[PDB]
Write a protein that binds this DNA or RNA. Structure first.
Lengths: 63, 122, 81
RNA sequence: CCCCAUGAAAAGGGAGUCUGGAACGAUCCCGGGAGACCGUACCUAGAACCGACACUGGUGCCCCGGUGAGAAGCCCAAG
RNA sequence: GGUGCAGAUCCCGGCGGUAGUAACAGCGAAGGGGGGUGAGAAUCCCCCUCGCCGGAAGGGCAAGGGUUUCCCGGCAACGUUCGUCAGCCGGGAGUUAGCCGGUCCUAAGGUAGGGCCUAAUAGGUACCUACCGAAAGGGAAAGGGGUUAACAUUCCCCUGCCU
RNA sequence: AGCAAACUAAGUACCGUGAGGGAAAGCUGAAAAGAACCCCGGAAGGGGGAGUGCAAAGAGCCUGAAACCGGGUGGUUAUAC
RNA sequence: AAGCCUCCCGGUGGAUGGCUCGGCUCGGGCACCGAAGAAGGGCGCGGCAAGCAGCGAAAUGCUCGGGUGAGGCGCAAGCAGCCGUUGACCCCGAGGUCCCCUAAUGGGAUAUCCUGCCGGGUUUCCGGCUCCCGGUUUAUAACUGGGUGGGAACCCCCCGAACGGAAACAUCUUAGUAGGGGGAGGAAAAGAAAUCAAUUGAGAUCCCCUGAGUAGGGGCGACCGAAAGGGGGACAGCCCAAACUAAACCUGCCGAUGAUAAGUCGGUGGGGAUGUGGUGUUACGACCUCUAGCCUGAGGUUGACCUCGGCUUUCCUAACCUAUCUAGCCGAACUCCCCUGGAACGGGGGGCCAUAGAGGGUGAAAGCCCCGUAGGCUAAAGAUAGGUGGAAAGUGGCUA
């Protein structure tokens, strides 16, 4: 789940919805506080770094 | 043109950065390897076969299964010591006390680095 | 914007008994929209909102849904219950 | 009744009298909507405040049946 | 050459003697019987009883403190003794407002910018303009019954009121 | 000693209403191989027997002086500095 | 028995010895940051994260180039998971995001927190909002475009003590010191004689060694104190006001051309006769004007006159090339035999390299085990310097 170069193919509208999907699954991953026993604790970090990549590509489109 | 102060020399080797730690792992090649590779020394990676020249286990030959790039030591399979309960632990030997017997030639970027270091023709 | 959902023993009793949710939000102190942030993310309707700031650097909201909607379904979807 | 004491100011309220404008129209009844932001736990003292201390000091203010003039001294409720 | 210590009411560190000694009384209170937990109870828990305060040793809330609050588990240090206990130690939690207060107004008082002064300002300031100055002054509108281990004119129910 | 500061956070902790003042503290071993297991103890890098290591002043860890305290060796002691 | 002296063993204690990724002094480099928001501070960010360091709601790190080649997730070794051979981590270069306070700057803060009015798309959000200067628009309305704070020491300018010494003390000294206020820079300041000295000489300023405790000041007490000259280091010089000319002039914006530069052409606005531009700034003389006479090329005119080609001063930067810097890389020769030992880096024997025997690491004291050393090589991109390149103006010399 490490997308790097298909993000430049998408348009400004598609990046807005992909950003929203990631921000929702990051909210769900915060059940690690609920002791819900996240098997992979490394998904919170991995998701937070995909949000940063999208906001980089959005900016590169001179938004 | 570097300092000869012993404290300045030791502060470099204890704070060596990641891309320069390969210097702590340099070891001599065997005589047969340098016939067919044209170099005299190389840094050690996991999967190489290694033989000891110094220590209480001199002459012992095995394969590298671990590295400690921050201190420059390697762990060889079958060279162990057992703890109080009985589970074995590795004996670490410095990379300057061993001689490399065979390489793992499967990186394709290690191989042309060896060629760039003037292997004869190919 | 929403940061986490609180699922302590006080928060669980409020879902079942008062039909409210407990969330930690940013403390941006120019607030009109926690109402329409949840009404958009979860497609529910909000009746009342009561907000708080804990002693350890958080802003906590007590959002109460309307009788047509159950806070248990929102909690169940997030995996809290 | 007294003073060679005469004992705060403003925002904010209500009303009145006039001037201009439109013919639609409430300070009265009925229904609907909205009302940011920040504080709020606990002690408040012969152990939570200041005095090097779980210091007989200081910082507190407001309140509380019989005998008896009594919020005194003595005895006892609620706590 | 930063070169030799017994003294400087020498500086710092460690350790004696006094000495297992003083003190743990005085300011108007007091315990006893039976049972429990625990490795270990004058000191923690339960029941009965007895004593003391009762214009404070009871009730309510400030400035100040800053988590001391509540639940669970502990006892190396901490508490003038002991400790299984605690305002101590470890792990989890807890503060909800149109109607309460700030927020607003001005008071005694102050400040910024202009002017005037100063060798100069981080200095002075009678004048002009603006702003600041009260969680006991002024200041629109809410009560009851209930609910948690810990919040409640703040949450629920009923009945309302202000702009 | 060397800058006040060689180190789990130096102008850090801590002291003052404030201007300000201002510490202490380095070292197992070549390698954690950091002492399995058994008896005692409520527990304790606690005791005993073991085991690791060239070597356990083994976590309060290099070497380990004196003052001070306890046990023992050799002299001696209640008519006298 | 209380005991007493001496040695041994133990405790307590932390001296002595050895060690050292820390200091201290010199040499040599290098040298400003900030309204495009600095320095300083406050709050946040890690799966479990308290501190330091790093980072800022894109928060223990995002994107693009180059180097490197197998592990990586800081100090910091756990539980659990993940990233990387589709080249990660790490290093260098260039970008993106960059909370609040802060010169703090729309207004307010004894609130590191609150709260406006215009313009733009439009959830979010993003721009504008004292003292001056040059302009617009009706005239105090509004609008376009342009100093403030920080820095260890050093530097420039004003204001300006006492302690102490004089064996007391007041002139004096201490001392224009300490300190206060204002202003800069990578250096500041000074700087081209209304100067020195002495038989007619030198030749801007600054710093070092001297002259010299000399001249000289002083209850002539304690004490204070030059310059010229000599020897060196570096060693430049211009530009205005004025005489004579009299709009021949400067500059904002738009279009073209020019490498987006300077410049040239065209159109609009602000200045300017209360003087913009040209000439010209030195002393037994300089500069300017007129008259007379002698002196490169081409051309015209009446030997003489005038007009275009060299020189002086100023403006400019892109393309290209070269060198250096920000990084990494190459780099000789024993791990031979015997003994001690836990381990040879020790002892004995044998050999080798050296433009390298500076230093370090490795189980002990290593030229030859490894890093390095003497000696050499490197860059897509930025940064610096040089070369090459483009333009504007003003211009005869000598004698009287």
């Amino acid at each position: 789940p490490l997308e790097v170069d298909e993000l430049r193919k998408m348009d400004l509208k598609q990046l807005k919805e992909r950003l929203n999907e990631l921000e929702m699954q990051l909210l769900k991953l915060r059940v690690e506080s609920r002791m819900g026993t996240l098997k992979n604790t490394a998904s919170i970090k991995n998701t937070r770094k995909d949000i940063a990549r999208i906001l980089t590509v959005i900016g590169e489109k001179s938004k | 043109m570097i300092s000869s102060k012993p404290s300045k020399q030791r502060k470099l080797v204890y704070n060596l950065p990641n891309h320069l730690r390969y210097k702590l792992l340099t070891a001599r090649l065997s005589e047969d390897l340098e016939k067919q590779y044209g170099i005299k020394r190389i840094s050690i990676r996991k999967g190489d076969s290694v033989k000891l020249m110094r220590g209480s286990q001199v002459g012992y030959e095995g394969k590298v299964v671990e590295v400690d790039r921050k201190r420059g030591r390697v762990a060889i399979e079958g060279l162990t010591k057992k703890k109080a309960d009985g589970t074995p632990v590795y004996v670490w030997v410095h990379a300057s006390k061993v001689i490399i017997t065979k390489l793992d030639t499967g990186d394709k970027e290690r191989m042309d680095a060896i060629e760039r270091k003037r292997k004869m023709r190919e | 914007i929403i940061k986490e959902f609180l699922a302590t023993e006080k928060a669980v009793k409020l879902i079942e008994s008062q039909n409210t949710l407990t969330i930690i939000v940013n403390r941006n102190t120019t607030k009109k929209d926690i109402k329409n942030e949840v009404e958009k993310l979860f497609s529910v309707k909000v009746e009342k909102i009561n907000t708080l700031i804990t002693p350890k650097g958080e802003k906590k909201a007590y959002v109460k849904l309307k009788q047509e909607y159950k806070a248990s379904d929102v909690a169940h979807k997030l995996g809290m219950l």
